[PDB]
């Protein structure tokens, strides 16, 4: 449907985000049968929302549990005559909500919010019970996809194809918000600029039988433009347009009035224009250079759960290190991260949860794009995730790119058949932004067959790590050669969205061999040397802020160790190399082929 | 503590600013939006939040600010602003009008803002937080200055001086007849529970249930309340609805209470007339990244670790914990020794200054008063909790200089008169043994901190066993009192191993915790053990702290050392609430 983030005005929120819900497992799938919605928690225990249920009890048998978990919470209802709505900003994978024995709504998104209108079903003044059924399972039509395997005892074991651990549960806000019966439930805003001198910001919104008078107030509450109608444009003059450095943000207050009731919604948008020209990524008609991380929503104890201290601290670290950009790696991030990126002018490459469409990253199906794995319904679900992501992050000026999928195996015939309609559909959904598909390493420029449909070429390369293990002299030649081959092929702006190596924070060696910090430094350094002599490399993005948790494997030593920082946010030796490089260059500009 | 039948203002981010030049109160920064502010998260200590070295140690004035919408549904009700905890000092302003202030730090403070607030429009909230300690703050300290005005704070406890807003901020609403004060005391012989009440223009009607609304008693009055006929295993707790009735509005307040009576008999600690044995940790309000800020995920996880390792009790070490810890504590029925921030009254703990600890320039007058205040507040907030079985006035004070007894006697007297239903204690330091301590008689349970084999007799088990044994049974023969060892632990690097089982290695933590447990087992007066710290925690910079205090069974990110499984074998291998029969 339509997605508007709620905000306090003559509108109200009761943060049911309160922790300490009742939590229980359903190892027998008796919950849907035995009507657990009715009343009690049976044999529950205290859990905390937001937060992943896997790491929260230090029980291994819970963290690998694959099935149905039950959340439970009684709450009181203060808003009368207002539309009361129950919003879940994120319930990872599947969630079915119940308000006092009655199914309200359900979702199969994972990292996208879903809400429901509960005005008839509640009465402001008495209690009410909310029971959530959260499913953490992945089959071939989920985004991301997976394979759940039962064995001889019927015990479910979830296997997937991405790297990060499949943290599940309620990860973001659960809120009970309250809006007048004539609401402003959808908005779209597109901005243009000409020579940083003047241009318009077209408006568009959806009401509940009310008219929309829209004003454009300033950063100090000064009206600069008005407008009367459901559509149309409106022009500023000599704007304070949104730059990657500062990030100026106008406050467009929209009004939807009825003959009796009225609703006012303030929506912050910044004037900026993002486009791709040849091999240049232009923000406000200036060629840009991306620097920063591909991070994860990962932490100790809470898993993929959200928390504010992590936001302010992580943004302080990136702010110190000189990073100006990041990419919401492998799933839509919490909207709060994108609000911060909006105010602080942080350019973001947004991505969907489509990751793992690849069976070469080592009882696996034998054809990746057959009916037994990634079929038409996988394509429908992928288009769904695109729809929801764009419908949530469409107005945020910090998003400059949509990324449909991550590292798909494109060698087999049919990858183009699967991905081309999704490129067409995404271009038809949001024309204001470039589109991309992050490229796997074993699909170099001479075997890929998908990168033509996208505006920006994103690359994940690990020459010298997975291949040429320990060889810098050779990985330099290979890396430079394939980079110039991508240039000779597509003449596109090339952002390296992943490049990193594993490093035991504390492992040193005089020989600068793999897994030591000296190898991380020398490796990133050589990669930077190659980066500086390719004209079409419009951005670099290291593989990963900090070490994150992965599934158990013989390649993951307590998870992925390719982070610049540790899981507790401590810098390895390479963090200060990146400090020197990024903070030493001119902001938003590519190095002049050398310092 | 609020319930209803509110809008939690601690949601999201606040504007944060520093006052290095100390211009805030003079230039009236609360009457405007903070110039040059940055986003900060509440709850959470401001020191660790920005990875800034200069912000972490800053000693002065910090400014929080946040606009909020007051809901329309609270038209004619009193609107109250509650700060569950603002560490050390806080002065709160509501939209150009000064409302409140408090020098507590680890206890809440609330203020009535009904006139200054018009429910429906947005108002701004500005908080001035101070993190300074002199000799009259609890805990005490002293600040020093030089040229360029750089302020540098020095204190006498171990843990790092985290500050800021550490617990939720509430904005609750009650009808014009509210239940401001409640008290409940439970008895049990081989019983019932007197009730209390304070209100304004309202009568008191008290009823109480069990599982769900199943009343099993009642009462109409501010006394008596006795009727029909809470354990450390599960923790059965009844629900006591209090009603305050007026001509127009009515108030209902639910208070969970568990039937229990704690008392000391000879050298036994009796909870419900049964001898007990304390096992568990002396923990801290410390975490990665957020300082002393509260968080539910951490409480759930740490309670999972304590449940797994077999702990049955712990002590809110060196300051009042967040009350959520105590609600959980009486829910799952874990025994809690509650303690004030009174720590650091000692000049002998020197890493290797006034001249006498109980002089006028240090610890005299307002110091004793404000200590009695920290008592009064801790008790006024945690009195009704059945999980609290003990009072702890102070921790590790130097009682050797002249005038210590003259200081500690009145505090014991007043505290005993305030809450006579629970035993009282004072954790004494190691440098004051049985032949030199002069205060352990004023208290019901004697608490001991002992580090034989670490600070003295460093690395020698064969003699530290003898010294610990002699000191222990000499205490027993001296005062014939119940002795809980509230601190015993040694530092340990998480990954350091050593074949020789020498200091700082995990083998030394294992073998050192073991000998202490045998000497514990051959002493009849030891009514419990609490390994020093649950998890490694942050302290001030010293040559004895290797990135904080490493005396934890778990690391800071909650990962177990070799001793965690030893203690999980010891505490769950014995019977719950029972001490081994000398083996
Ligand atoms: C057959 C040739 C294979 C080439 C190597 C492919 C490496 C893919 C790297 C992986 N790319 C995806 C990312 O989520 C992971 O964290 C990253 C990694 O594992 O470090
Ligand atoms: C004879 C006495 C020699 C010196 C003993 C010093 C004992 C001080 C105990 C200290 N008591 C306070 C506690 O927070 C600290 O963690 C603990 C410590 O040492 O780390």
Author numbering:
A (entry chain A): -1 to 77, 80 to 362, 369 to 601
B (entry chain B): 3 to 7, 11 to 195, 199 to 237, 242 to 364, 370 to 600
The paper states:
However, intestinal bacterial GUSs cleave the attached glucuronic acid for use as a carbon source, allowing potentially toxic compounds to re-enter the enterohepatic circulation. However, microflora-encoding β-glucuronidases (GUSs) are notorious for reversing the glucuronidation to release SN-38 in the intestinal lumen and thus represent the major cause of undesirable effects. GUS contains a deep enzyme active site (the two catalytic glutamates lie ~12 Å below the protein surface). To understand the underlying structural basis, we prepared C6-propyl, -hexyl, and -nonyl UIFGs (2–4, respectively) and resolved the eight X-ray crystal structures of 1–4 bound to EcGUS or Bifidobacterium dentium GUS (BdGUS).
Particularly, C6-nonyl UIFG had 23,300-fold higher potency for EcGUS than for HsGUS (Ki = 4.5 nM for EcGUS vs. 105 μM for HsGUS). The IC50 was as follows: 2, 1.2 μM; 3, 18.6 nM; and 4, 3.69 nM. Consistent with the aforementioned Ki values, 4 was the most potent inhibitor. Furthermore, EcGUS contains a narrower aglycone-binding site than LgGUS and BdGUS. Taking the comparison between EcGUS and HsGUS as an example, the aglycone-binding site of EcGUS is surrounded by five hydrophobic residues, namely Phe365, Leu361, Val446, Met447, and Phe448, which are located in loops 3 and 5, whereas the site of HsGUS is surrounded by Ser485loop 5, Tyr505loop 6, His509loop 6, and Thr599loop 8. This difference explains why substitution with an alkyl group at C6 of UIFG remarkably enhanced its binding affinity and selectivity for EcGUS. The alkyl substituent of the inhibitors therefore facilitated an increase in hydrophobic contacts with nonpolar residues of loops 3 and 5 in EcGUS, e.g., such as Leu361, Phe365 in loop 3, and Val446, Met447, and Phe448 in loop 5. Interestingly, owing to the longer alkyl chains of 3 and 4, Phe448 rotated outward in EcGUS/3 and EcGUS/4 and thus increased the hydrophobic contact area. This additional hydrophobic interaction might have compensated for the binding energy loss owing to the absence of the water-mediated H-bond network, leading to the observed lower Ki values of 2–4 for EcGUS compared with other GUSs. Similar to the previous trend, the entropy contribution of 3 and 4 increased with the length of alkyl chain (–TΔΔS2–3 = –1.32 kcal mol−1 and –TΔΔS2–4 = −1.34 kcal mol−1 for EcGUS), while the enthalpy contribution decreased (ΔΔH2–3 = +0.04 kcal mol−1 and ΔΔH2–4 = +0.99 kcal mol−1 for EcGUS).
